[PDB]
From a paper:
Template-independent terminal ribonucleotide transferases (TENTs) catalyze the addition of nucleotide monophosphates to the 3′-end of RNA molecules regulating their fate. TENTs include poly(U) polymerases (PUPs) with a subgroup of 3′ CUCU-tagging enzymes, such as CutA in Aspergillus nidulans. CutA preferentially incorporates cytosines, processively polymerizes only adenosines and does not incorporate or extend guanosines. Here, we report structures of the catalytic core of T. terrestris CutA (TtCutA) in the apo form and its complexes with a non-hydrolyzable CTP analog and A3 RNA.
Therefore, based on in silico predictions, we designed over a dozen protein variants that were truncated up to predicted helices at both N- and C-termini and tested their expression and purification efficiency in a soluble and intact form. This approach eventually led to a TtCutA240–603 fragment that contained the catalytic core of the protein. We first obtained crystals of the apo form of the protein, the structure of which was solved by SeMet SAD and refined against a data set from native protein crystal to 2.25 Å resolution and an Rfree of 24.1%. The protein conformation in the apo state and in both complexes with nucleic acid is essentially the same. We observed small movements of the palm and finger domains relative to each other. As expected, the overall protein structure is very similar to other TENTs and adopts a bilobal architecture. The active site and incoming nucleotide are located between the palm and finger subdomains.
Residue numbers in the entry: 248 to 373, 375 to 598
């Protein structure tokens, strides 16, 4: 299911004359783009009826696990879009199951239990982190779940903190995520594109590099870190009420930020030289991380909790060329306020 066909080649896109790149939206385009974005954001927001279904699934799973394997304090947690304020009604339910009972990390044992109790399309992937995928026919929800993936819970908590800092982040990130789904550039497993978490990091990194910045570098704000419930200091600043309002110095609207996001990644950002690091909040070079030797390093996005891992390693040179075309395609359409055409649903050739 290769998203970017090998026929694209690997050539770098041309450097367009800077005078031919639109510098800012016109007054009419921004006003219409602003209303079109807030109308779409209202459609993208989740509904209460589906929110209670996701909580019913969590409770149903937690009862099934504790009744089948009692005495192990098995708890079910939401993470990803389900826990960072960025999910929609059609989003999957991403679940992290925790227990001190290490035997539960054999996930096909979980797959058998859920299939035995009526779940459908039950597949286990025993893989980076083992995953059980189900489809709940009663609640009409798809669910991916892993066991003791505490890293996913922490960086979900980091994304949620970033979303809580500035009220423009949630609508901006949800609209961009919607764009990644419509263009089908959010499949790092089979399509060769970028993961949902990779895109969120690219959004945060863009917001950190604005002048003035919309978001801070939470990993570097040492004086704003709280003691977690395990007794350890949080790796990132998480004092949300004290962090709120950090981006108020930036006066750009939602419409301008969407325009600048695509403009940044279409023409401004030098993909060949720099690594995007939301951990540092500044640009790093590939050379200072020795990342000029990484295979699939055309796009370097540093994972904040493991600076030795490039989130963009799922994109080869052909996939990156197609990804760069989509970002330039998006920039040209948003520069004219064409939000609907920017989000045209991609369809795979037969
Ligand atoms: Mg403040």
């Amino acid at each position: 299911r290769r998203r970017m066909p090998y026929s694209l080649g690997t050539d770098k896109l041309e450097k367009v004359d800077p005078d031919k790149i639109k510098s800012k939206l016109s007054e009419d385009v921004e006003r219409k783009l602003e209303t079109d974005m807030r109308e779409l954001y209202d459609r993208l927001l989740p509904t209460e009826a589906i929110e209670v279904n996701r909580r019913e699934l969590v409770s149903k799973l937690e009862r099934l696990f504790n009744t089948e394997w009692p005495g192990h304090d098995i708890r079910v947690h939401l993470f990803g879009s389900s826990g960072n304020l960025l999910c929609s009604d059609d989003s999957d339910v991403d679940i992290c199951i925790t227990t001190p009972w290490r035997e539960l990390e054999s996930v096909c044992m979980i797959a058998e239990l859920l299939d035995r109790h009526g779940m459908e399309k039950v597949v286990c992937v025993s893989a980076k982190v083992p995953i059980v995928k189900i489809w709940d026919p009663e609640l009409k929800l798809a669910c991916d779940m892993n066991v003791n993936n505490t890293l996913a819970l922490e960086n979900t908590r980091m994304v949620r903190t970033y979303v809580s800092i500035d009220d423009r982040v949630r609508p901006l990130a949800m609209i961009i995520k919607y764009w990644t789904r419509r263009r089908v550039v959010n499949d790092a497993a089979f399509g060769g594109t970028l993961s949902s978490y990779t895109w969120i990091c690219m959004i945060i990194a863009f917001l950190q590099l604005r002048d003035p910045p919309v978001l801070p570098a939470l990993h570097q704000q040492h004086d704003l870190k709280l003691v977690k419930q395990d007794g350890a200091l949080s790796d990132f600043a998480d004092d949300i009420p004290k962090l709120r309002g950090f981006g108020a110095k930036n006066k750009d609207s939602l419409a301008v930020l969407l325009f600048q996001f695509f403009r940044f990644y279409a023409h401004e950002f030098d993909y060949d030289k720099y690594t995007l690091s939301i951990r540092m909040g500044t640009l790093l070079t590939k050379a200072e991380k020795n990342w000029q030797y990484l295979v699939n390093n055309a796009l370097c996005v540093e994972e904040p909790f493991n600076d030795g891992r490039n989130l963009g390693n799922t994109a080869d040179e052909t996939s990156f060329r197609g990804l760069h075309m989509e970002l330039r395609r998006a920039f040209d359409l948003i520069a004219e306020g064409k939000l609907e055409e920017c989000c045209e649903q991609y369809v795979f050739p037969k």
